[PDB]
Design an enzyme around this catalytic site. Structure first.
Site, PDB file in Angstrom:
ATOM      1  N   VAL A  19       1.416   6.574   4.900  1.00 17.71           N
ATOM      2  CA  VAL A  19       0.337   6.687   5.875  1.00 17.71           C
ATOM      3  C   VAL A  19      -0.555   5.469   5.741  1.00 17.71           C
ATOM      4  O   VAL A  19      -1.092   5.209   4.681  1.00 17.71           O
ATOM      5  CB  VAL A  19      -0.499   7.954   5.636  1.00 17.71           C
ATOM      6  CG1 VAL A  19      -1.771   7.920   6.466  1.00 17.71           C
ATOM      7  CG2 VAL A  19       0.318   9.187   5.964  1.00 17.71           C
ATOM      8  N   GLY A  46       1.569   3.783  -3.041  1.00  9.31           N
ATOM      9  CA  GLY A  46       0.556   4.730  -3.491  1.00  9.31           C
ATOM     10  C   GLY A  46      -0.129   5.545  -2.413  1.00  9.31           C
ATOM     11  O   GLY A  46      -0.948   6.402  -2.720  1.00  9.31           O
ATOM     12  N   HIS A  47       0.209   5.293  -1.157  1.00  7.66           N
ATOM     13  CA  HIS A  47      -0.515   5.903  -0.070  1.00  7.66           C
ATOM     14  C   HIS A  47       0.410   6.353   1.064  1.00  7.66           C
ATOM     15  O   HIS A  47       0.398   5.756   2.113  1.00  7.66           O
ATOM     16  CB  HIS A  47      -1.552   4.906   0.430  1.00  7.66           C
ATOM     17  CG  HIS A  47      -2.629   5.515   1.256  1.00  7.66           C
ATOM     18  ND1 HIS A  47      -2.453   5.824   2.584  1.00  7.66           N
ATOM     19  CD2 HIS A  47      -3.901   5.851   0.954  1.00  7.66           C
ATOM     20  CE1 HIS A  47      -3.576   6.329   3.068  1.00  7.66           C
ATOM     21  NE2 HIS A  47      -4.473   6.344   2.102  1.00  7.66           N
ATOM     22  N   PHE A  48       1.178   7.428   0.879  1.00  7.15           N
ATOM     23  CA  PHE A  48       1.229   8.226  -0.357  1.00  7.15           C
ATOM     24  C   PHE A  48       2.667   8.277  -0.848  1.00  7.15           C
ATOM     25  O   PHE A  48       3.586   8.101  -0.059  1.00  7.15           O
ATOM     26  CB  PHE A  48       0.676   9.637  -0.105  1.00  7.15           C
ATOM     27  CG  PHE A  48      -0.734   9.630   0.377  1.00  7.15           C
ATOM     28  CD1 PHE A  48      -1.783   9.449  -0.509  1.00  7.15           C
ATOM     29  CD2 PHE A  48      -1.015   9.739   1.718  1.00  7.15           C
ATOM     30  CE1 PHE A  48      -3.102   9.394  -0.065  1.00  7.15           C
ATOM     31  CE2 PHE A  48      -2.326   9.693   2.166  1.00  7.15           C
ATOM     32  CZ  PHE A  48      -3.375   9.519   1.278  1.00  7.15           C
ATOM     33  N   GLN A  73       0.798  -1.208   0.000  1.00 10.77           N
ATOM     34  CA  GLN A  73       0.000   0.000   0.000  1.00 10.77           C
ATOM     35  C   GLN A  73       0.847   1.282   0.000  1.00 10.77           C
ATOM     36  O   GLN A  73       0.387   2.331  -0.453  1.00 10.77           O
ATOM     37  CB  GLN A  73      -0.980   0.012   1.157  1.00 10.77           C
ATOM     38  CG  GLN A  73      -0.364   0.028   2.539  1.00 10.77           C
ATOM     39  CD  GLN A  73      -0.117  -1.356   3.099  1.00 10.77           C
ATOM     40  OE1 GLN A  73       0.028  -2.330   2.358  1.00 10.77           O
ATOM     41  NE2 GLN A  73      -0.077  -1.453   4.406  1.00 10.77           N
TER      42      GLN A  73
END
EC number: 4.2.1.59
Lengths: 144, 144, 144, 144, 144, 144
Positions: free
Chosen positions: B57, B50-52, B47
């Site tokens: 986060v 892309g986050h972020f 994750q």
């Protein structure tokens, strides 16, 4: 703003990137009021290695995340903002029901509506349909 | 049942696999009542591409998903069940608040509690702590 | 320098990114002497698809890589450097022993120490613990 | 045994899978003595997203891991074993020197040799070459 | 231009990145005429999770994609261009035959030739060899 | 056979898995004659990390691959076969034109037709449409 907003441009609005960008296209928008977005569900998505190994089922929480991203983009577009100057936090989820299994081949249509805006905190109604039927509905709170 | 239940054994209980298995270890369990589980948050998780992109986060919805998985395993362990028999659906989320940013390095401690079991539908209270502070709290419904 | 150094800031110091950034947080630092870092081990990490399919076991070599990264950041922090102006090569490994299986749920604590700095080549002692027990120890050489 | 042993069959010998299978093909084998294996280095490998973002450099520790896997398969083949009965642990690394940057397009040739077998612990010499030049050399210990 | 062109520099020429950069190195180049490039095939590539689960087989279409990328770079190099100004579309594939299974361990050698350039549309002949044998051959059209 | 055939069941027919399963759903089927299938294009697909970094564009070759998979399943269904039974090789591509950019949000509709079956080699006509417009057309050869 020019509709539809394509994924390449959704990315100019919010910082989310693969594998956590869960909107493909913005199709409708009423400033300070409503937004429609879609997310195509495909077997070629990273979640389907594990959810579940021989039985692809779109995780509810990712549908929730898309709903929140739609709400957030509604907000951002409404103050003509961008990804570089503004962030809306995901503050809470209220009355989320998971009513239908979503599967590869389904196109999720998200319709969201700004309900109340007390003090930088926005309360939204959000629904996610496949072929007209409700799959997930929820109230989404975002905070500036 | 032998505690702690390690990830390799959580997989014998629920069908979820990478990247949608969001519990690392079960550390406490009272049949039909409570369960504690952990999830380690690391920068080496999918994750965080892309986050972020430059700001890792932990997505709230993945914390929610872990909470739901913990509730589900509490249920499964309580009827001595397994992954291969029948299944507990994620039915809804009720009063979810996101109170703290969770980041690589944090160990999420999940404490869940079976509140009511009105006819196949289990209502659970769930909290997720980092270092004793609440990061997320929510009510989780599962349906048999 | 302000402790702890979070992952987001470790990335300002070294060029390593997903899936080859194997430190989550710097927790201790004595210039030109010692450093402590952690790495959370989670089942939600890419290596656990293949290592091993039903039996998650943290690869020793990735523990080694983390050790080397910790050594390298100790060095970088000691000359107040950054990721953009120069590089510490991984030159050799000397007396590496793998003493304990590390598994999802474990938090690796890395303690490293600068031993000698003969000729731009830094010799370090490094240990990796889980819950106080040694899992991996090794001598790590870096070259400027 | 039939040479070359292709990746599909290396998988019948050892449990390692993507992204932690670091041998492509076994090309030479002398029972209880030596083995040659190759690993093709390509820009289309998962490590190169992060190591390093614009500068692909094969991590030394993965070359080490390949060396260890080659040693382990030499052992396994020597007692006619398989992945379902026997496991050889990676016990230590001894005199590992990283002499050359390895990059996409390089074919790594691994030559390993069983030195001593004192009490289930096997001590191996291992070298990894690109185009005849040594890139990494090390002593590898495996334990049954 | 300086040969060989390494992957790090191929990326300055074309926008393709992981997992859709299918050239590792440019080895030969005659302006407006020919180019040779290689792509190493390794079991550590993302396509081999699914193609096929226990039987790694390089997809023909990725070989085709490489052929097209080689043609495109031949064109780009010939007008001294870069990734930031000039782009060639993949317009068609003409007489593509898949003659040999390609597997981990194989090094693909691509030889491409500019045939005709009638009005911005370039017609190329392209072949892909493993150890001298043809694996794939095709005519590739690119459009400026 | 019962229509639509969902992705979970397409997998019982062909061995392709993530990230090389490029059909989401079979929607039409005439034995020994025609088939319709769909593939949803989403920004949440692995290819869009690299193709292209800020500009998501569905690779033509993956559209080609889908076309081939559709042809193959038409064949398989027609002799009531399965994935464990036998296999149709991709033998060639004939008159492939790429006419339209395909982007996240688009649903690809594939219509394929069995033209001739000269001795285990099947020649197919295949088209891929988005919203009624042709995006890719080609002749596809499969070999038993």
């Amino acid at each position: 703003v020019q509709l539809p907003i394509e994924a390449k441009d959704i990315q100019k609005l919010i910082p989310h990137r693969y594998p956590f960008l869960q909107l493909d296209r913005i199709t409708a928008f009423e400033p300070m009021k409503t937004l429609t977005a879609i997310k195509n569900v495909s077997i070629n998505e990273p979640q389907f290695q594990g959810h579940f190994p021989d039985l692809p089922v779109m995780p509810g929480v990712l549908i929730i995340e898309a709903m929140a991203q739609a709400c957030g983009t509604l907000a951002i577009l409404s103050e003509g903002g961008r990804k570089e100057n503004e962030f809306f936090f995901f503050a809470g989820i209220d009355e989320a029901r998971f009513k239908r299994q979503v599967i590869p081949g389904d196109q999720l249509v998200f319709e969201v509506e700004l309900l109340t805006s007390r003090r930088g905190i926005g309360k939204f109604n959000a629904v996610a349909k496949v072929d007209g039927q409700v799959a997930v509905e929820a109230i989404i709170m975002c905070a500036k």
